[PDB]
Ligand binder design. Sequence first.
Ligand SMILES: CC(C)CCC[C@@H](C)[C@H]1CC[C@H]2[C@@H]3CC=C4C[C@@H](OC(=O)CCC(=O)O)CC[C@]4(C)[C@H]3CC[C@]12C
Ligand SMILES: CC(C)CCC[C@@H](C)[C@H]1CC[C@H]2[C@@H]3CC=C4C[C@@H](OC(=O)CCC(=O)O)CC[C@]4(C)[C@H]3CC[C@]12C
Ligand SMILES: CC(C)CCC[C@@H](C)[C@H]1CC[C@H]2[C@@H]3CC=C4C[C@@H](OC(=O)CCC(=O)O)CC[C@]4(C)[C@H]3CC[C@]12C
Ligand SMILES: CCCCCCCCO[C@@H]1O[C@H](CO)[C@@H](O)[C@H](O)[C@H]1O
Ligand SMILES: CCCCCCCCO[C@@H]1O[C@H](CO)[C@@H](O)[C@H](O)[C@H]1O
Ligand SMILES: CCCCCCCCO[C@@H]1O[C@H](CO)[C@@H](O)[C@H](O)[C@H]1O
Ligand SMILES: CCCCCCCCO[C@@H]1O[C@H](CO)[C@@H](O)[C@H](O)[C@H]1O
Ligand SMILES: CCCCCCCCO[C@@H]1O[C@H](CO)[C@@H](O)[C@H](O)[C@H]1O
Ligand SMILES: CCCCCCCCO[C@@H]1O[C@H](CO)[C@@H](O)[C@H](O)[C@H]1O
Ligand SMILES: CCCCCCCCO[C@@H]1O[C@H](CO)[C@@H](O)[C@H](O)[C@H]1O
Ligand SMILES: CCCCCCCCO[C@@H]1O[C@H](CO)[C@@H](O)[C@H](O)[C@H]1O
Ligand SMILES: CCCCCCCCO[C@@H]1O[C@H](CO)[C@@H](O)[C@H](O)[C@H]1O
Ligand SMILES: CCCCCCCCO[C@@H]1O[C@H](CO)[C@@H](O)[C@H](O)[C@H]1O
Ligand SMILES: CCCCCCCCO[C@@H]1O[C@H](CO)[C@@H](O)[C@H](O)[C@H]1O
Ligand SMILES: CCCCCCCCO[C@@H]1O[C@H](CO)[C@@H](O)[C@H](O)[C@H]1O
Ligand SMILES: CCCCCCCCO[C@@H]1O[C@H](CO)[C@@H](O)[C@H](O)[C@H]1O
Ligand SMILES: CCCCCCCCO[C@@H]1O[C@H](CO)[C@@H](O)[C@H](O)[C@H]1O
Ligand SMILES: CCCCCCCCO[C@@H]1O[C@H](CO)[C@@H](O)[C@H](O)[C@H]1O
Ligand SMILES: CCCCCCCCO[C@@H]1O[C@H](CO)[C@@H](O)[C@H](O)[C@H]1O
Ligand SMILES: CCCCCCCCO[C@@H]1O[C@H](CO)[C@@H](O)[C@H](O)[C@H]1O
Ligand SMILES: CCCCCCCCO[C@@H]1O[C@H](CO)[C@@H](O)[C@H](O)[C@H]1O
Ligand SMILES: CCCCCCCCO[C@@H]1O[C@H](CO)[C@@H](O)[C@H](O)[C@H]1O
Ligand SMILES: CCCCCCCCO[C@@H]1O[C@H](CO)[C@@H](O)[C@H](O)[C@H]1O
Ligand SMILES: CCCCCCCCO[C@@H]1O[C@H](CO)[C@@H](O)[C@H](O)[C@H]1O
Lengths: 356, 356, 356
Amino acid sequence: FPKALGYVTGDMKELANQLKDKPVVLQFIDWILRGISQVVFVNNPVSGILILVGLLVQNPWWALTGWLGTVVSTLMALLLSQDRSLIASGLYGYNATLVGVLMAVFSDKGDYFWWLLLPVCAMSMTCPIFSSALNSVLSKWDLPVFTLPFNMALSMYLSATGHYNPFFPAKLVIPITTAPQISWSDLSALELLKSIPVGVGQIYGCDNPWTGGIFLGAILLSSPLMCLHAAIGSLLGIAAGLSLSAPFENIYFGLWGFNSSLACIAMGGMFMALTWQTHLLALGCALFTAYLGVGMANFMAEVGLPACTWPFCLATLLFLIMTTKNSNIYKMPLSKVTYPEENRIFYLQAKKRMVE
Amino acid sequence: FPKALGYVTGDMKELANQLKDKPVVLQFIDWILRGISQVVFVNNPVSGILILVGLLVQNPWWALTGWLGTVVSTLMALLLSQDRSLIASGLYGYNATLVGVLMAVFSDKGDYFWWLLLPVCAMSMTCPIFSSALNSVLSKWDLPVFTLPFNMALSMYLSATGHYNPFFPAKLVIPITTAPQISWSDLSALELLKSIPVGVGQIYGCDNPWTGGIFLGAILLSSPLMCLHAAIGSLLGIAAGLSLSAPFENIYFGLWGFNSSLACIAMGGMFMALTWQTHLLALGCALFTAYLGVGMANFMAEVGLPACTWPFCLATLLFLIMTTKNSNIYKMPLSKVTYPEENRIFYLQAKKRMVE
Amino acid sequence: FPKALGYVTGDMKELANQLKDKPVVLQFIDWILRGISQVVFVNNPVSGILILVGLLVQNPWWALTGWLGTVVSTLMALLLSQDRSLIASGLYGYNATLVGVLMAVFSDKGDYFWWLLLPVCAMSMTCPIFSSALNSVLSKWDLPVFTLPFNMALSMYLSATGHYNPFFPAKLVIPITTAPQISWSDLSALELLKSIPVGVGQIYGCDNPWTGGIFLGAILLSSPLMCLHAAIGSLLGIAAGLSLSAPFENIYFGLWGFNSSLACIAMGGMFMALTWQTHLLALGCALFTAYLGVGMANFMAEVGLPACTWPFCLATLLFLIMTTKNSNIYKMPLSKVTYPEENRIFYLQAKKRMVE
Ligand SMILES: CC(C)CCC[C@@H](C)[C@H]1CC[C@H]2[C@@H]3CC=C4C[C@@H](OC(=O)CCC(=O)O)CC[C@]4(C)[C@H]3CC[C@]12C
Ligand SMILES: CC(C)CCC[C@@H](C)[C@H]1CC[C@H]2[C@@H]3CC=C4C[C@@H](OC(=O)CCC(=O)O)CC[C@]4(C)[C@H]3CC[C@]12C
Ligand SMILES: CC(C)CCC[C@@H](C)[C@H]1CC[C@H]2[C@@H]3CC=C4C[C@@H](OC(=O)CCC(=O)O)CC[C@]4(C)[C@H]3CC[C@]12C
Ligand SMILES: CCCCCCCCO[C@@H]1O[C@H](CO)[C@@H](O)[C@H](O)[C@H]1O
Ligand SMILES: CCCCCCCCO[C@@H]1O[C@H](CO)[C@@H](O)[C@H](O)[C@H]1O
Ligand SMILES: CCCCCCCCO[C@@H]1O[C@H](CO)[C@@H](O)[C@H](O)[C@H]1O
Ligand SMILES: CCCCCCCCO[C@@H]1O[C@H](CO)[C@@H](O)[C@H](O)[C@H]1O
Ligand SMILES: CCCCCCCCO[C@@H]1O[C@H](CO)[C@@H](O)[C@H](O)[C@H]1O
Ligand SMILES: CCCCCCCCO[C@@H]1O[C@H](CO)[C@@H](O)[C@H](O)[C@H]1O
Ligand SMILES: CCCCCCCCO[C@@H]1O[C@H](CO)[C@@H](O)[C@H](O)[C@H]1O
Ligand SMILES: CCCCCCCCO[C@@H]1O[C@H](CO)[C@@H](O)[C@H](O)[C@H]1O
Ligand SMILES: CCCCCCCCO[C@@H]1O[C@H](CO)[C@@H](O)[C@H](O)[C@H]1O
Ligand SMILES: CCCCCCCCO[C@@H]1O[C@H](CO)[C@@H](O)[C@H](O)[C@H]1O
Ligand SMILES: CCCCCCCCO[C@@H]1O[C@H](CO)[C@@H](O)[C@H](O)[C@H]1O
Ligand SMILES: CCCCCCCCO[C@@H]1O[C@H](CO)[C@@H](O)[C@H](O)[C@H]1O
Ligand SMILES: CCCCCCCCO[C@@H]1O[C@H](CO)[C@@H](O)[C@H](O)[C@H]1O
Ligand SMILES: CCCCCCCCO[C@@H]1O[C@H](CO)[C@@H](O)[C@H](O)[C@H]1O
Ligand SMILES: CCCCCCCCO[C@@H]1O[C@H](CO)[C@@H](O)[C@H](O)[C@H]1O
Ligand SMILES: CCCCCCCCO[C@@H]1O[C@H](CO)[C@@H](O)[C@H](O)[C@H]1O
Ligand SMILES: CCCCCCCCO[C@@H]1O[C@H](CO)[C@@H](O)[C@H](O)[C@H]1O
Ligand SMILES: CCCCCCCCO[C@@H]1O[C@H](CO)[C@@H](O)[C@H](O)[C@H]1O
Ligand SMILES: CCCCCCCCO[C@@H]1O[C@H](CO)[C@@H](O)[C@H](O)[C@H]1O
Ligand SMILES: CCCCCCCCO[C@@H]1O[C@H](CO)[C@@H](O)[C@H](O)[C@H]1O
Ligand SMILES: CCCCCCCCO[C@@H]1O[C@H](CO)[C@@H](O)[C@H](O)[C@H]1O
């Protein structure tokens, strides 16, 4: 356990290095699994395997379409001569992971609608394009693209099909038009506790509590700090939902937790170096993101769309673009971002250099 | 009167300088009052007091929530280590002024719904963040953020609550679905004249004609040119409304005047040096802004939102980003923007330098 | 024929050069006709005459309002001291061409509603402003503005009037709310073939097949490659429509073809040098653009608007911003863009220089 562990924590760069001479198919599978895990900012193929297992526990059909999307986007990125370092760390696959899974989730035709593999492929082939274009812009400000490629691809696909498409109908999204009757005496502490892993699970559209727990274990295996912040951000989404008197069903289903979870991971040591100041900033950002999440869900329902993780992308870019004159609130150079423990060591070293 | 006057015109930089050694609470109150007056591009705490009086004449509850928002945003800006020069000239408070007032205005729970002070605080704490992020982008093109922070915060809050929220319901916004019967014989010249100050008053969501008049006097006290352009832009909004056969009630209520008023102030000597060419350009921009105002009100009503001053921000940024080869149409360096009289002296000097 | 031909192919730069000394009214008419032809990226006044003839075959009223818009925008661009090279090649007129025609097309008052010439003028005067502002941004990334000026002007005008305006009502746009009954046995190969020129004709909102054919001949006269790509992109839009089970009426009317036609022209040798790789990329972009076209039509119908060519602008900017490490997928310097034959000669020369 102690020896074998260190080999599977972090971003497994030793395995990445040892694969560079191995048969190209093994390298490809490594890129697929890292693409899957990058949905939660993790660059680790063992975490990608565990996330696959969680997807399979939720619904093997969604596991299939998410895996298929990852493969097609990775192949497209190669056909289009994208940067190999980005491909090899999964950054040309994770948006198509979300595309495949959530196309399955929002289909109105149910499990194993095999025709769905056509649009799943089609939209997956657009993810590198979306990814390349956005990167070419945002990298000039040293910002990441997050899941903007996925959200653009999905809003476009779901607007194009809609509920009335004869071939690929989507689920009908209906805006609220009555105040939800709220009976606070039925509030269940056990179900709210359960909503924390579910909120993590909904990052991949999964409502099964066991799947959210498996996702948390995947993150934990890569990085304990990231896992802490995933859980905390899910929790903060729950608290926000209750602050706005949201129907308990939606909280229990994790709909208030996946955006704030993603924002809390990103801000809590990932793209900002972890100090007590940026920890509080990440809690603030998670809360803010939950409020933006419900606002965008309402707004998008007026046009028949889900919000998915538009809220996370917009909020987290906003917090990363804000400046301060506080030396302890430090944004990571993207070329130096790995995972919170390591980022913190970099920050402390650079600070000792600043103090010389 | 003549001696004491000069001390209260302009941006009162002598008082700003004399406060730098005074007790920190007096400095803070000065920053609050300047934040209030910056809603109309004025950097003057006496104007901020007069605007407070106008708010109180409209509705003391809105005065309270606007003041509270200004205070919380200013405190947040300090907690977040924002630039002190910007804070001290009110630029980290005015967006939260609008947030506090217009949250009161669009609440469906009426005057003195004390629970409303919670979201008023919450959204006010986001205004520095919105303000910092936007500034970090727009200042690279030497552009101001205008009221984009406020409009983003408010669209997000109002989308998140909506009309059916059990705790903080908003007013219901209903899109038009019948042509308004228009009886032109009832057009009242007295009421259209009255619509000019009301259009200025609606910059802070105030429909009381006395309040609009007090706002005009606040602007006048700081700068006669800015006050002229406020009035003219309100008037141009009226004319636009009539050009589109708008219902008289909406014109009389000032809904056609506040965006074009703001655009006319901004363009008429503030962010462009005042020449006869830029005066005409500012009239054009005010008209354009009124037309964009009604377009965005219709579009946003389709999703349940008011447009507030999205039209002013988008239109005025558009006119400030346009280039010309006309030496007399000159955009002010932001580091040199104070108020139109002074900006014009700078422009004339720089032009004499250009002619040497 | 052989001698006189070469004088009218391409961008007719010899005529442009010989006009520089001629009476200023002839120069102005040349700028008008080039503005008209730039709707399809053509810089050629004979093509502009042929496109006028096609407009007249569709509906002389639309010919009138499109011509009037071109004239007013060109005059405005001069009044505002815009760059003369851009004006003289039609780039300050084509957005107002579309404004005039499509305001006529979406009016609910029918042919020869003479009052419509007021908003046609008004919105045409905004096209240089929109054009200047957008250029000032996009030219920093070496990107064109495409028809974003037109689409912004039109979305703003149509939102401001809407269907219920007492003076300038627009056509009512109704979102889909039932699945279209689809009877595939009635599919007509003759009508699908006819949909190719109609798809080109709808670039100017024209459904008459003869008008689309005249437009294709205008493009052909300037550049055979551009004409090939116009036809192919229209065809690809047809195929997309059938892939999404669109009602045959909409395909036959060319609604699936005009955006993908424009994208295919732009990408197929115009703003990318033409190689077999960029030819395939342009086919992909045309298909992608057709799918985005239907998505934006659905989304915009939820707020009462047409999509017009928002899809073409957004998709083509996206494909032009994507990077690759493929030396054969080469984006043209804007200062070197003329028409595909010539651009290809430039690319081959620069490549021989790269290989030395
Ligand atoms: C969720 C929406 C409605 C509001 C989001 C607000 C948060 C983003 C704010 C509220 C409290 C703020 C924190 C309160 C005060 C502090 C301590 C402050 O530290 C100091 O200024 C002194 C110590 C030092 O030198 O760093 C740094 C900012 C921070 C973490 C703030 C960060 C931003 C926070 C978390
Ligand atoms: C409201 C929407 C529908 C249209 C908005 C149009 C305005 C922005 C346009 C219309 C008339 C234009 C003005 C008409 C002509 C002039 C004179 C022109 O001056 C000159 O070109 C010669 C003198 C010199 O050298 O400056 C400068 C631009 C200006 C003010 C134009 C500025 C822009 C204006 C106000
Ligand atoms: C319409 C939406 C749903 C999908 C749009 C997908 C297209 C944009 C993709 C699909 C097939 C792709 C093409 C398939 C493979 C090739 C060959 C490839 O050439 C090479 O990599 C080797 C030869 C060389 O060195 O150039 C260049 C990219 C290209 C044209 C690809 C360009 C982008 C294409 C057309
Ligand atoms: C029972 C737990 C051990 C299972 C088999 C060994 C896997 C441990 O991991 C091993 O770590 C080594 C580090 O020196 C690497 O060189 C190996 O490639 C790697 O497999
Ligand atoms: C091509 C698609 C855009 C790529 C932009 C990457 C910018 C972010 O940077 C990446 O963040 C990852 C976390 O998600 C880390 O695993 C990587 O080490 C880091 O380089
Ligand atoms: C190849 C790895 C991905 C999973 C493939 C699983 C195929 C299951 O097959 C599906 O099983 C259903 C019953 O469970 C049937 O109702 C469906 O018709 C059938 O297609
Ligand atoms: C069917 C999917 C196969 C994907 C592998 C394609 C790899 C080769 O395609 C590309 O060729 C370019 C030529 O200039 C190279 O620059 C790129 O590195 C390469 O990715
Ligand atoms: C690369 C993408 C390939 C897509 C292949 C689609 C094959 C469709 O297959 C069909 O699916 C239907 C719906 O589930 C079933 O009812 C049919 O039995 C099956 O033939
Ligand atoms: C270019 C694409 C053409 C594909 C034609 C495939 C037709 C498949 O079949 C059709 O599927 C429809 C789906 O709702 C049904 O409504 C039709 O009755 C059925 O005939
Ligand atoms: C590119 C187009 C691929 C999808 C076309 C068919 C999708 C809808 O086809 C579905 O399944 C059966 C397939 O024969 C039909 O009979 C059903 O009516 C329909 O629900
Ligand atoms: C009746 C009008 C006068 C009221 C009291 C004096 C206020 C005038 O203003 C005074 O101007 C001086 C300029 O020399 C400053 O030094 C003072 O601080 C300021 O109070
Ligand atoms: C932090 C929030 C953004 C600040 C950007 C300020 C850019 C505009 O600049 C400011 O304009 C004011 C008028 O409104 C003037 O009073 C100031 O003197 C001037 O610096
Ligand atoms: C402290 C400065 C801000 C203004 C505070 C005013 C408090 C008024 O108090 C309000 O007065 C109403 C009657 O006018 C009552 O109906 C409300 O219940 C009461 O809260
Ligand atoms: C409760 C509200 C109190 C606001 C005052 C907080 C001022 C101190 O907080 C911040 O500390 C930073 C430490 O690096 C400094 O750089 C900043 O200038 C300062 O604003
Ligand atoms: C910093 C923000 C503090 C918010 C304090 C909210 C206090 C709520 O106070 C309550 O308000 C209700 C609505 O007006 C009244 O009906 C109750 O009497 C009153 O107790
Ligand atoms: C974490 C936040 C939990 C706050 C619980 C406070 C409940 C206040 O009370 C509730 O207010 C609702 C408002 O419409 C009413 O509908 C309920 O009947 C009432 O019990
Ligand atoms: C963070 C949550 C704060 C707001 C919760 C309560 C807001 C709605 O509470 C309001 O006033 C009374 C308060 O007891 C209730 O009885 C009323 O039903 C309700 O209208
Ligand atoms: C019948 C076809 C010819 C019609 C009249 C001559 C038009 C041909 O075009 C001519 O080409 C010349 C190139 O040397 C130019 O110098 C002329 O200006 C141009 O008119
Ligand atoms: C002022 C409005 C924006 C102008 C930006 C022009 C950038 C594109 O560049 C232009 O493309 C045209 C094709 O459409 C070519 O005819 C021109 O030669 C080329 O310069
Ligand atoms: C001047 C060049 C543009 C075309 C002008 C055409 C004017 C036609 O005039 C129109 O003709 C219609 C019948 O066709 C009548 O019904 C309309 O009332 C009349 O205005
Ligand atoms: C009624 C329409 C007439 C249009 C012609 C106007 C041309 C002069 O107006 C402008 O004057 C500026 C003065 O600095 C020059 O820089 C510009 O080149 C010029 O276009
Ligand atoms: C520069 C813009 C000038 C606009 C002139 C508008 C003239 C309106 O003219 C009117 O048009 C009506 C509608 O077609 C007709 O019914 C009337 O007979 C005609 O007088
Ligand atoms: C500032 C602009 C004022 C213009 C007033 C012109 C009135 C033209 O006339 C009006 O046109 C309306 C159009 O639907 C009709 O409903 C009215 O009955 C009619 O009187
Ligand atoms: C700037 C305002 C210009 C347009 C105002 C009138 C537009 C609608 O006027 C139209 O035509 C006739 C004109 O008298 C009216 O009698 C009709 O009722 C109306 O349909």
